[PDB]
Amino acid sequence: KYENHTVTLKILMTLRYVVSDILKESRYQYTKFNQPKSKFENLPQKLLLKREDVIVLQDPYKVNDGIEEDLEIQ
Amino acid sequence: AITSVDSYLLSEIKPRLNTVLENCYIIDEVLKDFDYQTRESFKEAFCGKNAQHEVTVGFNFPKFKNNYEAHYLIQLGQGQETKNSLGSIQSSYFEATGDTLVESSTAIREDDKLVFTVSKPIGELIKVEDIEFAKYDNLQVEGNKVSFKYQTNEDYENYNANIIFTEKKNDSKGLVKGFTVEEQVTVVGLSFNVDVARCLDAVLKMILISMRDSIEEQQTFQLQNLSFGDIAPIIEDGDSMIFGRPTIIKYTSSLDLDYTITQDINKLTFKERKD
Amino acid sequence: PIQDAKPIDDIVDIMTYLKNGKVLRVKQDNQGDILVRMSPGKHKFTEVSRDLDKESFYYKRHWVLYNVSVNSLITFDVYLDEEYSETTKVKYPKDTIVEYTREDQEKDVAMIKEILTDNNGNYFYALIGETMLFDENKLNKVKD
Amino acid sequence: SIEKKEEVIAHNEVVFRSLTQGLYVKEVDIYSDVVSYTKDVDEALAMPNTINFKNSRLIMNLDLEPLNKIQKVIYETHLEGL
Amino acid sequence: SIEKKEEVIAHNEVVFRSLTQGLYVKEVDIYSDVVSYTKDVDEALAMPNTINFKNSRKYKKLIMNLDLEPLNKIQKVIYETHLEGL
Amino acid sequence: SIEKKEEVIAHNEVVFRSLTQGLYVKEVDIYSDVVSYTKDVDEALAMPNTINFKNSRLIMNLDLEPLNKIQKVIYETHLEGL
Amino acid sequence: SIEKKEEVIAHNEVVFRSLTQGLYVKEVDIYSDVVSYTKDVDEALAMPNTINFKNSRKYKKLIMNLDLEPLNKIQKVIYETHLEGL
Amino acid sequence: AIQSQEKGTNQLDIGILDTGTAIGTTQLEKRISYRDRFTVPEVLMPQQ
Amino acid sequence: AIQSQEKGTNQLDIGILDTGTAIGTTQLEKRISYRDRFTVPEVLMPQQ
Amino acid sequence: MIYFVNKDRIKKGIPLYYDVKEITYIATQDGTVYEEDYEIKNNRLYLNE
């Protein structure tokens, strides 16, 4: 029916980001209190992200689990 | 046959460059002018089959990292139209012909003839090395082989020769439409050490000269015009700068297309006026 | 009858087959079928591939690591890949909900568990909680 | 199977090999006597294996095994059934 | 006496033959169903099958077709060096 | 109704169809014997349906149904009352 | 024997005829009232009526006029393929 | 964690184009790489 | 909610032109789209 | 990083741009690679034929 026509749409899409630069990359701490010995731990990084509009890839294929959500047990 | 100059540069450079760096004698001739210190340090690094360091080549805006110790970088550059022809016509051919090839072959002993065999149909022959076939030889082509008669040539049953020939595809005669394009392409060497860059540029100039003898260059890419820029810091936001001398290469080539003709006249009938 | 499906019941067998290195095929609900594998070499870890079709001169399976969960294995259907038949051409697959009339002409809902056929392709179905067979026409698919 | 095949002989030449070392000839002097030897079979000094060349000069040296060399290059295609 | 042997692959593509007709496909429609046939290996439809092009998508509806017989076409050049004594 | 109409015949040609497969001719060999077949009616190999062409060469092949083909294109206008 | 039939629309516009005079309008004034008449379909005033131009405004005062009879003019080209045996 | 989610839009000769920018804060012991990718199924974005 | 309602005016060769800018804060669960449109009947703006 | 292998690099060993402490993931057209086929010495990489 719409062989020669112009179709216009409004759509909802899932949000996506990619990493353009890493800001305040590595932050550190020699945690020692209440430990057998000194330990090194990496504190949170900060990321500068950009949205994917010029190139778009579909959402990743995640392996599903058979566990039913909101399951009642007894 | 639209010509991708950028691809041609890469095809020629990659094999020839490796061969030049492989041996030391040629490098000495190339770097004859340079001082002893720079000459040998470059040779110690890249020259020889046993060179740990190696040179690389690639196009601009790659998403990976290049070997900034030594690298050749290419970018397409401008293009312009310079000369036309009437009806945009270049040439007319009776046979659909592809590239022009050079092949080596040995003569084979047939009964009446000695024949050379080639990997593809011969189409148009151009030359067999240092043979001027006389009419009594009756030189002729057949499929993928070329033949000349045996008598008074009997010492040559084992003749080893090179052959220049064209790839034949079809018998469909057609015309050529196109024009000449004046194209410029940029080439630059990169390093974090200026001395390496100067040696690298000089090596490039030599292989450009050698390319003047190539089949593709002689037939398709003519009228070299080289232009060199000033040594500049390509990069400054880093632990050390990158230095490179850009060069500009100009070419003259044809952008051609094949137009096929089907109106072959074979019959011809004369009829007089009834009056 | 047709033996297109040979589901594995015990996960212990699955692990045993995995130790043998044979590829598995794990079903998913409203999602693409997947293949699972144990890596060769010194380090043993589970690998997965989204490529289902058979290995060929034009088609090579792509394998990558993953932290697969036993919960998917123990719950979802599992098969030996090479022994699996792609489909069983019947109107209502197994575990499909249908509405049927009982022997006393009273209507009840049921799900299907049977595979029987003559040599012409005529199929019969036996319903969960039922004994006798039911034809393709008698059963009616229950809409979601 | 084979659908199409052709064999063409690129070169026919004579190569020189030392009888003592077994190294092939790489470079020679003014009168074609050897100055350098190499182990490479193909890089070895070679000349066309034609009768006229022999009359035009094997002749020069004694620690000399004049060997013949031939190159075969073959173009073939296959249709491998399933 | 064979001295050195080298094998090189020029091309590697897939060609499809009809079991009944015995022809090779040359063209397909918008739906990728056959439009034409040809009895020439050099002119037949081809799917590139070098290493980078494996696991394609363009011809899924073609491959699944039972009447078609995929064939792996390979073109090779081999160099054989000889020594023949004195 | 029709206010103005005219019919013009763009082409008159002869097309070749195989009797066995029913596929039309797409390409032919040196002597116009078929090398390729196609299902398309219009893309099929065709030639003008003129007497002179027949004398200038149906002739060549036996699995051959020489069919005639004609194209009609019609220009028309309407005034559709209310 | 008709083999393939295709129908194509070249133009689609609206032409107005006077019920009494029987002429077609060719021109209008600032108020869009008639300035002139013509007895020629090719020269008559036209309102474009392809799909994008529907529901216009330029000729409201014209359309409401009872003396005028709007007419939908359509121009077409149809292609008819034939086969006539041997 | 994510902050300052921004949809910057550029109107150009080539057309309209979206160049959004945002700032993220991660967990401990995670090393991120240039041109890594994140996707938020829960959040939906409108387009025309 | 709206803030910093601004009537920026540019005097140009083409004439005078208004390029105003303002900042808005919305309700929950509302997704806005590029080049959406708002109008405030209550507020009146003078022009000549 | 990504590198292209040839008949010469395979014998010499790949010269790595960066340094190395440990490797995480390796892949090619044939898929991943295992410890039995690759080795690293003096910040250059060797591979089998």
Coordinates of C-alpha atoms in Angstrom, one line a residue, chain A residues 8-73:
Chain A
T8 CA 8.2 9.1 9.4
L9 CA 8.7 7.7 12.8
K10 CA 9.4 8.4 16.5
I11 CA 11.3 5.7 18.2
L12 CA 12.9 4.8 21.6
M13 CA 16.3 3.2 21.7
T14 CA 18.6 1.9 24.5
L15 CA 21.4 4.1 25.8
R16 CA 25.0 3.4 24.8
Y17 CA 28.4 4.9 25.5
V18 CA 32.0 4.4 24.4
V19 CA 35.2 5.5 26.1
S20 CA 36.9 8.4 24.3
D21 CA 39.4 9.4 27.0
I22 CA 40.3 8.3 30.5
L23 CA 40.4 11.1 33.1
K24 CA 42.0 10.7 36.5
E25 CA 43.0 7.2 35.5
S26 CA 44.6 5.5 38.5
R27 CA 44.2 6.2 42.2
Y28 CA 45.9 4.2 44.9
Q29 CA 46.0 3.3 48.5
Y30 CA 48.3 1.1 50.7
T31 CA 45.6 -0.5 52.9
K32 CA 47.2 -1.9 56.0
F33 CA 44.8 -1.5 58.9
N34 CA 43.2 -4.8 60.1
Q35 CA 45.2 -6.8 57.5
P36 CA 47.7 -9.6 57.8
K37 CA 50.0 -7.4 55.7
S38 CA 50.1 -4.4 53.4
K39 CA 47.8 -4.6 50.3
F40 CA 47.5 -2.5 47.2
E41 CA 44.1 -1.5 45.9
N42 CA 43.0 0.4 42.8
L43 CA 40.4 3.2 43.5
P44 CA 37.7 4.2 41.0
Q45 CA 38.7 5.6 37.7
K46 CA 36.8 8.4 36.0
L47 CA 35.8 8.0 32.3
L48 CA 34.9 10.6 29.7
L49 CA 32.3 8.9 27.4
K50 CA 30.7 9.7 24.1
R51 CA 27.4 8.5 22.6
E52 CA 27.2 6.2 19.7
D53 CA 25.3 7.9 16.8
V54 CA 27.5 7.9 13.8
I55 CA 28.0 4.1 14.0
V56 CA 25.6 1.9 16.0
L57 CA 25.9 -1.7 16.9
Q58 CA 23.2 -3.9 18.4
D59 CA 23.0 -4.7 22.1
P60 CA 25.5 -7.5 23.1
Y61 CA 24.3 -11.1 23.2
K62 CA 24.3 -11.9 26.9
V63 CA 24.2 -15.5 28.1
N64 CA 20.9 -16.0 29.8
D65 CA 20.3 -17.9 33.0
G66 CA 17.4 -20.3 33.5
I67 CA 16.5 -19.0 36.9
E68 CA 13.0 -17.6 36.9
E69 CA 12.9 -14.0 38.2
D70 CA 10.7 -13.1 41.2
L71 CA 10.6 -16.8 42.3
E72 CA 8.9 -17.9 45.5
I73 CA 10.4 -20.6 47.6

